[PDB]
Swiss-Prot record, chains A, B:
Residues involved in L-arginine binding: I18, S21, G22, A91, C92, N96, W197, I200, W268, S332
Free-text note regarding domains: Each subunit has 12 transmembrane (TM) domains, arranged with an internal layer (TM1, TM3, TM6, TM8 and TM10) surrounded by the outer layer (TM2, TM4, TM5, TM7, TM9, TM11 and TM12). TM1 and TM6 are interrupted by short, non-helical, Gly-containing loops in the middle of their transmembrane spans. Homodimerization is mediated by TM3, TM10, TM11 and TM12. Each subunit has a central cavity which binds substrates. Upon Arg-binding the N-terminus of TM6 and Trp-197 move to prevent Arg from return to the periplasm.
Annotated membrane topology: Multi-pass membrane protein
Family note: Belongs to the amino acid-polyamine-organocation (APC) superfamily. Basic amino acid/polyamine antiporter (APA) (TC 2.A.3.2) family.
Protein's organism: Escherichia coli O157:H7
InterPro entries: AA/rel_permease1 (IPR002293), APC_superfamily (IPR050367)
Entry protein name: Arginine/agmatine antiporter
Amino acid sequence: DAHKVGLIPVTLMVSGNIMGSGVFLLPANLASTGGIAIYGWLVTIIGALGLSMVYAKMSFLDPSPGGSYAYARRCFGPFLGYQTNVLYWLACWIGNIAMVVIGVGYLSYFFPILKDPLVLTITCVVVLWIFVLLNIVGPKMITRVQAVATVLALIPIVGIAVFGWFWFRGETYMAAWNVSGLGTFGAIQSTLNVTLWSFIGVESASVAAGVVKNPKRNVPIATIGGVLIAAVCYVLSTTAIMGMIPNTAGAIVSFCAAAGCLGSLGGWTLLAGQTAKAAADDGLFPPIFARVNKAGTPVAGLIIVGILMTIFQLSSISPNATKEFGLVSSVSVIFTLVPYLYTCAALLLLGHGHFGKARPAYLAVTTIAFLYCIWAVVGSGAKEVMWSFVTLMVITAMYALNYNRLHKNP
Amino acid sequence: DAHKVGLIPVTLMVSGNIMGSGVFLLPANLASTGGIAIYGWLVTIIGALGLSMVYAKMSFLDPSPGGSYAYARRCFGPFLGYQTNVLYWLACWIGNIAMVVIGVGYLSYFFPILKDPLVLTITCVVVLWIFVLLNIVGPKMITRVQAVATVLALIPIVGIAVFGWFWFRGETYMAAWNVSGLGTFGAIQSTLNVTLWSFIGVESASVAAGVVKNPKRNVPIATIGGVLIAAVCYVLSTTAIMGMIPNTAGAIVSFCAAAGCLGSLGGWTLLAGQTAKAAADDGLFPPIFARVNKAGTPVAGLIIVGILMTIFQLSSISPNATKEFGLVSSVSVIFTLVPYLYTCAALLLLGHGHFGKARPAYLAVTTIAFLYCIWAVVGSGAKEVMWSFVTLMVITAMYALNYNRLHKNP
């Protein structure tokens, strides 16, 4: 198959959905800290790379076509995996509405603007279907969108990596040094708590399956590529941290950031159609989507995701926490963790005896992945989390929509 | 079998674990409200009776011998059910330490006393093993303890039901009327939020199985008996609500309350040994307990529960929230919900097509049970709930202790 994309724009997708709509804000987020504190990066990147490794050698096997639910079919995988879906896709199109309220806030000036009245919302609303239709064109086309746009948002960051390496200069960062944070013991927390729940994305590769070239080779290479990429991106970019704290070619840096939300948005609508029109086939949901107009792609799928997406775009217009951490926009963050959980549960529930040799080695990386996934939700908002769990209780008993499973019957 | 108890002291067990260590405090808990507000009772009792009905017609089938995990073997039932255990048992012996810090605070005077220094703790510590050994004697003996002691704590409440019906008098309650609460719309919340998470217990019957007479008949009758009992107990007792708000034979009323924690404590250590030395056999945990010295009963089991119970009795001595809602003593409240959840999931996952006729009827009661269970955790402490969920993530990835399940393998 050649109408089914490949590594080159896949790793870019995978990377650029972590990159991605949070880097041009990351330094800011550890400015109110607590700043550098590079340690925070050390540990969050080590454990996250572990998570990407998990995903790598799992899609190394059954990709999938999901994934991150594919493997849920085998912590169980009915109930638990059909759940894992609801709560991930329902955190797939939801996290999108978040993505536009910021992505267009990134073009809040520089032509248009406007961008303050009802115009902000009317444009995020039409900016979404942009990518919905650009998925009805794909999937090979939406990945073509992401490739160009994120290598656009790569200009800024990568530019500061080496070029920023030649500018500043120098011992200024040494001047600001650590401190501000309330000491090393927990000081890290002030950084981890914003480099962690913001490494979210490694899934996209083992979630493309159904439209990557060769899964068993390209996809594992995809996540590991994506993670090492965004990772050094993160470090070299936010090590450009001299002393400031207050929060010509400037226009390019402001355009290239929104251009990350140019590719991202497509990417996540994509992930939205995938891990759902997937558990359409491996069983139930229910669907509906389907219906997969000939040549792949969920025609009903992404269109339906459009309706679900737009409906919330016009009532979170608007209050819901006017920015990040919105009791709805953040919870959907937590949601995307469970599938991190069962996955790693699976890269061992399906190495029952490992169709691969040397145990302890894989045995660590998965444990590490478990800290990372457990820690980055252990240390987060108290209304938000209880919330996820409320959704778990409700996802569950919303399987009355489901009286036909089986196992260990009577 | 006749060394295996029967309905007569079983329903008393089942009832007196909800009764039970919260009634002589219940009116107090809706005094700071918001008081009567009898509605709160209306809705909490209707949905709870639904929950008991759920449990009734489930143990009507497979009892079990668990239960409330028995049936988990069939939302899955490996991982999910072995979980459902950890999080219920670890909420079974934990809820106990809570039970003694109050049950002896109930004899904080009237002989002994003391009851304020290190003596409070040294006595709760030895008061626990009391029931641990009185379970090593049972299980028919511990139920004999609960029967006598709760029909002792029945004297107070039931006495006010009819006798209290002849005393006051009269329109005083009409004088205090509703109000104080911030209006009907949500006013109920101030009552439901303390009549709900305080109806916990209906499980005990469908959790005795392994030591009730005939399961299929006695156990269903047990929970429904238990619930209607504690229910009218609740209503007729806390309808003795005249106007007061500040918070000879008086000694009897103060003794008879602790005497509820005389029987309760035994009951829950009991439930502790049960839904664990049960998932010892249906599979894994791991155990250990076992080892079931001849004639039933988990000898290693309750003894081990003693060590786990005493260890926390001497470091929650002491701070941990010096009373109810202890971020550990309350969470373990939330924990005892999940098994409520999968249960009701099961009275339909195992009525796949109902080995019983007329669908919609059973179809409601289970839905109602789902509200009750979901609502009473939807509306509770924010650190506590996120906490349960953290335990869910950890229960989970603590099944590395478990690399040998199966289903839909590769």
